[PDB]
Amino acid sequence: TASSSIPMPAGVNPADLAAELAAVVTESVDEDYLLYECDGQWVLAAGVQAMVELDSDELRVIRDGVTRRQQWSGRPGAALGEAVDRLLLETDQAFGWVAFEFGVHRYGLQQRLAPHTPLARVFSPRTRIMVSEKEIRLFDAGIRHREAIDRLLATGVREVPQSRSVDVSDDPSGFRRRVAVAVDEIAAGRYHKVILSRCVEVPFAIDFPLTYRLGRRHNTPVRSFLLQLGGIRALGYSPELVTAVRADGVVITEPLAGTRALGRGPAIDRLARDDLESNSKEIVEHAISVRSSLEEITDIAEPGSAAVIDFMTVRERGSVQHLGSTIRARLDPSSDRMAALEALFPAVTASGIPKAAGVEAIFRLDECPRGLYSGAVVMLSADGGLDAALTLRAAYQVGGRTWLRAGAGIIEESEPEREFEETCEKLSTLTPYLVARQ
Ligand SMILES: O=C(O)c1cccc(-c2ccc(C(=O)O)o2)c1
Three-class SS of the chain: CCCEEEECCCCCCHHHHHHHHHHHHHHHHCCCEEEEEECCEEEEEEEEEEEEEEECCCEEEEECCEEEEECCCCCHHHHHHHHHHHHCCCCCEEEEEECHHHHCHHHCCHHHCCCCCEEEEEEEEEEEEEECCCEEEEECCCHHHHHHHHHHHHHCCCCCCCCCCCCCCCCCCCHHHHHHHHHHHHHCCCCCEEEEEEEEECCCCECHHHHHHHHHCCCCCCCEEEEEECCEEEEECCCCEEEEECCCCEEEECCEEEEEECCCCHHHHHHHHHHHHHCHHHHHHHHHHHHHHHHHHHCCECCCCCEEEEEEEEEEECCEEEEEEEEEEEECCCCCHHHHHHHHCCCHHHCEECHHHHHHHHHHHCCCCCCCCCCEEEEEECCCCEEEEECCCEEEEECCEEEEEEEEEECCCCCHHHHHHHHHHHHCCCHHHCCECC
Give CA–CA dist 378/382, Å, rounded: 14
Give CA–CA dist 243/328, Å, rounded: 10
Give CA–CA dist 333/335, Å, rounded: 5
Give CA–CA dist 145/139, Å, rounded: 10
Q: Which residues are 229's β-sheet partners? A: 232
Q: Which residues are 93's β-sheet partners? A: 381
- Closest by CA position to 97, among listed 191, 236, 199, 211: 236
Question: Distance between terminal CA atoms of the chain?
Answer: 38
> Which residues are within 8 A (CB) of 185 and not within 5 positions of it... i.e. 6 or more apart?
191, 194, 361
- From the CA of 169, how far away is ligand 1's center (Å)? 19
Give CA–CA dist 274/255, Å, rounded: 20
Residue 169 sits at φ, ψ, to 5 deg, of -75, -20
Q: Point out the residues that are catalytic.
A: 240
* Buried b or exposed e, range 273-307, using 16+ CB within 10 angstroms: eeebbeeeebbebbeebbebbbebbbebbbeebbe
Q: How far is CA 421 from CA 91, 270, 275, 363, in A?
A: 46, 20, 18, 23
- Closest by CA position to 374, among listed 360, 355, 394: 394
Whether the Cβ atoms of residue 372 and residue 232 lie closer than 8 Å to each other = yes
In this structure, the residues whose C-beta lies within 6 A of any atom of ligand 1 are 195, 197, 256-259, 285, 322, 349, 392-393, 406-409, 426
Give CA–CA dist 149/291, Å, rounded: 47
> Which residues are within 8 A (CB) of 197 and not within 5 positions of it... i.e. 6 or more apart?
175, 366, 367, 370, 373, 374, 405, 406, 407, 408, 423
Give CA–CA dist 209/216, Å, rounded: 10
Angle (deg, nearest 10), helices 175-187 and 416-427: 120
Q: What residue type is 378 in one-letter code?
A: V
Name the experiment that determined this structure. X-ray
Whether the Cβ atoms of residue 379 and residue 88 lie closer than 8 Å to each other = no
Q: What residue type is 403 in one-letter code?
A: W
Q: Which residues are 323's β-sheet partners? A: 257, 314
Q: How far is CA 377 from CA 63, 147, 241, 383, 387, in A?
A: 21, 29, 10, 19, 8
Q: Check whether the bond before 354 is cis (ω within 30° of 0).
A: yes
Atom 5 (ligand 1) nearest CA:
257
Resolution for the entry shown, Å: 1.6
Q: Which residues are 321's β-sheet partners? A: 260, 316
Mutate to test the pocket of ligand 1, among 179, 256, 419 (most ligand atoms within 8 A of CB): 256
Q: Which residues are 410's β-sheet partners? A: 194
Whether the Cβ atoms of residue 430 and residue 406 lie closer than 8 Å to each other = no
Give CA–CA dist 383/402, Å, rounded: 37
Mutate to test the pocket of ligand 1, among 241, 392, 403, 404 (most ligand atoms within 8 A of CB): 392
Whether the Cβ atoms of residue 100 and residue 388 lie closer than 8 Å to each other = no
Residue 30 sits at φ, ψ, to 5 deg, of 60, 55
Give CA–CA dist 200/186, Å, rounded: 26
Residue 193 CA: nearest ligand 1 atom is: 1
Q: Taking the CB of residue 410, how many other CB atoms lie within 10 A of it?
A: 29
Q: Binding-site residues, please?
A: 258-259, 285, 373, 393, 407-409, 419, 422, 426
Residue 408 CA: nearest ligand 1 atom is: 10
Give CA–CA dist 256/26, Å, rounded: 35
Q: Going by DSSP bridges, is the β-strand pair 352-353/193-201 parallel, antiparallel, or unpaired?
A: antiparallel
> Which residues are within 8 A (CB) of 330 and not within 5 positions of it... i.e. 6 or more apart?
249, 250, 251, 301, 302, 305
Whether the Cβ atoms of residue 387 and residue 223 lie closer than 8 Å to each other = yes
Atom 12 (ligand 1) nearest CA:
407
Q: Binding-site residues for Mg(2+), please?
A: 285, 419, 422
Q: Check whether the bond before 369 is cis (ω within 30° of 0).
A: yes
- Closest by CA position to 122, among listed 225, 36, 53, 46: 53
Q: Taking the CB of residue 400, how many other CB atoms lie within 10 A of it?
A: 6
> Which residues are within 8 A (CB) of 258 and not within 5 positions of it... i.e. 6 or more apart?
276, 279, 281, 282, 283, 285, 286, 322, 323
Whether the Cβ atoms of residue 242 and residue 388 lie closer than 8 Å to each other = yes
Q: What residue type is 32 in one-letter code?
A: D
